[PDB]
């Protein structure tokens, strides 16, 4: 499926014991409204604790939103390896339930915290 | 002069009386002669108050840094007019002899605070 792509970054604040998730921008998203646009936003959380969650601002009438946001998760470094970061992109609708675009998951045990990288990943269906 | 370009956003937080400056990324920063890259960072401040200032993190060995930062200036909305935002991109030096790459200035009087946009602007010579 061609659902667009998301650019994000991961870092760990070793001084305050927090995971830092940069949600930078998305590109080439599907148009889920009339007239060729969507109103995208991203939900961000860590599995298995769907507790502590964030979402970006809703960007209106764009398939290439520049979020420029950063989220902070208080999670002990020794426990981070067992977590999976979920970034799920939706189309905000006022007059109906929000339309799923797609998502990407990052198992935290795959992450190198030695240097921050910006990563593009293609969105997937759940 | 082919100095590259900077993507930024401006907004005003009307509930907390703060100017919001997004420093998203830069692109196509000029390649030095011998050493092929730069270590870019951006200084951000509001003229005529040079004292309240911010800087991005330093990004190592890149001509296309993705800063993904947001800065806030406590300034009354009624005082914005006549002020100018400066965004100046430097090549970091360990010993604080930083080299300006280029800059540009946004007079508040040119900004429409009714709608938030991300804008790319070409860097200009000091
Ligand atoms: Ca829709
Ligand atoms: Ca919509
Ligand atoms: Ca809907």
Task: Give DSSP secondary structure letters for A15-42.
Answer: TTTEEEEEEEEEES----STTS---EEE
Euclidean distance between the first and final Cα of chain B, in Å? Answer: 11
CA angle B115, B118, B119 (to 5 degrees): 115
Nearest chain B residue (CA) to A9 = B68
Residues in chain B: 126
Experimental technique of record: X-ray
Query: What are the residues whose beta carbons fall under 8 Å from the beta carbon of B64, sequence distance 6 or more?
Result: B25, B26, B27, B28, B29
Is B33 part of any known ligand binding site? yes
Distance A59 CA to ligand 2 centre (A): 10
Cβ atoms B112, B11 nearer than 8 A = no
Residue A119 β-bridge partners = A8
Cis geometry, peptide bond prior to residue B45 (ω within 30 degrees of 0): no
Give how far B76 is from chain A: nearest CA, Å.
Answer: 24
Return the SS3 of A108. helix
CA A47 – CA A108 distance, rounded (Å): 10
CA A113 – CA B9 distance, rounded (Å): 28
Domain boundaries, chain A: 1-126
For residue A78, give the H/E element and its range.
helix A77-80
Task: Give DSSP secondary structure letters for A58-69.
Answer: PPPS-SS----E
Query: What are the residues whose beta carbons fall under 8 Å from the beta carbon of A60, sequence distance 6 or more?
Result: A39
From chain A, the residues in CB contact with B68 under 8 A are: 9, 22, 24, 68, 70, 118
Distance set, CA B1 to CA A49, B23, B106 (Å): 51, 22, 19
Expressed in Å, this structure's resolution amounts to 1.6
What are the tokens at A104?
A: 């990407």
For residue A77, give the H/E element and its range.
helix A77-80
Distance A93 CA to ligand 1 centre (A): 5
């Amino acid at each position: 499926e061609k659902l667009g792509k998301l650019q994000y970054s991961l870092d760990y604040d070793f001084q305050n014991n927090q995971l830092l998730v940069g949600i930078i921008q998305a590109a080439e998203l599907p148009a889920l409204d009339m007239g060729g646009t969507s109103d995208p936003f991203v939900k961000v959380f860590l599995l298995p604790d769907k507790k502590k969650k964030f979402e970006t601002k809703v960007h209106r009438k764009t398939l290439n939103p520049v979020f420029n946001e950063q989220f902070t998760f208080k999670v002990p470094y020794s426990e981070l390896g067992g977590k999976t970061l979920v970034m799920a992109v939706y189309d905000f609708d006022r007059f109906s339930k929000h339309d799923i675009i797609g998502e990407f998951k990052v198992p935290m045990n795959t992450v190198d915290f030695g240097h921050v990288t910006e990563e593009w990943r293609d969105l997937q269906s759940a």
